[PDB]
Amino acid sequence: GSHMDPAQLTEDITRYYLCLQLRQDIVAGRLPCSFATLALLGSYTIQSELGDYDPELHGVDYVSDFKLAPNQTKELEEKVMELHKSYRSMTPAQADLEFLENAKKLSMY
Template identity: 50%
Template sequence: LPCSFVTYCILGSYIVQSEAGDHDPTQHIGIKYIQDHPFAPHMLQTPEMLGRIVELHKLHRGKTPEEADRLFLSNARKLALYGVDLHKVKTSQGQDITLGVYYGGILLYRNRIRLMRISWPRIISLSHRGRNFIIARRPGDDSLDRNMTFKCISPTLAKRLYN
């Protein structure tokens, strides 16, 4: 999930507490004990981030794995894209966008900026044909086409979005 540096550190510290237990200075030396765990996208996970995760891990002494998991979920669920199933697709004009499916409907993003939210009540039907995923929308105040077609990377993805 995309989030801030601080949030990656907090979430990472709960993962470490859940998996490694309380910080033990004799076993948990520096950042070595966590450096092989992916806490953030590779390009964002720096020694500075790992050091911050270690410092936060020390503060979680006494928390059980269940408590650490609950705290992880409590923080993760507040993220804007928590629970959104994101997929790279192309518009009918060939533009790269990200399509997200979530409990409230479908989200469309370009370069991490939300372009549109289509709530389930505004959707008449969903369909797929080959690599195409099609959304038929109810007429509304906007001037956009009622049918929106997206080209997926595979027919399997188009079918998955449909289901």
């Protein structure tokens, strides 16, 4: 068995920084991407940043706190919130793997 691992801290350090750098390059437009990917990578980061959605609290303009891109428009914004709530009972790891798997599949770094 054994699930916890005090030695598996490196992967955490790398992953955290990775997302920070990757998301930083995107928002700054340091890499050519499409609207769909922008909204997809963003929707995942948002869900992982704020976890599952909660209509009880509402927000609408909550995405304004997270920079998903330099030229954020109602379209990109909408797709961000839509995809976020569109995701069923998804787990945190799923989101982390979603963006990481996407960035790795695109060869961003």
